[PDB]
Each structure stands twice: as structure tokens, then as C-alpha cells.
Amino acid sequence: EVVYDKISKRQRLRVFKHEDGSERVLSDGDHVEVGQQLMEGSADPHEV
């Protein structure tokens, strides 16, 4: 299981299309695909 270490509360959680269901912000227990972005902001393109 993957661990993303620490993110400041300054980063608002990503409200995303949220396939396998509705359109809403990220809550605990949600199901995430291989490419989905977890936080709101800018994603590293080396990562992608």
C-alpha cells in the first residue's frame, strides 16, 4: 500500500469527476483510479 507522507491543510482536497459514482470532493474510503489526482493544485509531470 502506497503512502503519501504529509500535505498541509493549505492544500484543498481535490473535487474530481470521481468515477465509480458521483462528482464530489475526496473523502476517506473513496475508490481511486491509477491516474486520479488526490489534492487540488498542480501535479508533477515526471510523476504523471
Experiment used for this model: X-ray
Q: How far is CA 44 from the centre of its chain?
A: 13
- Strand segments (E) across the chain: 15-16, 24-25
Distance CA 18, CA 30 (A): 9
For 5-17, b/e burial (b = at least 16 CB within 10 A) is eeeeeeeeebebe
Final resolution, Å? 2.9
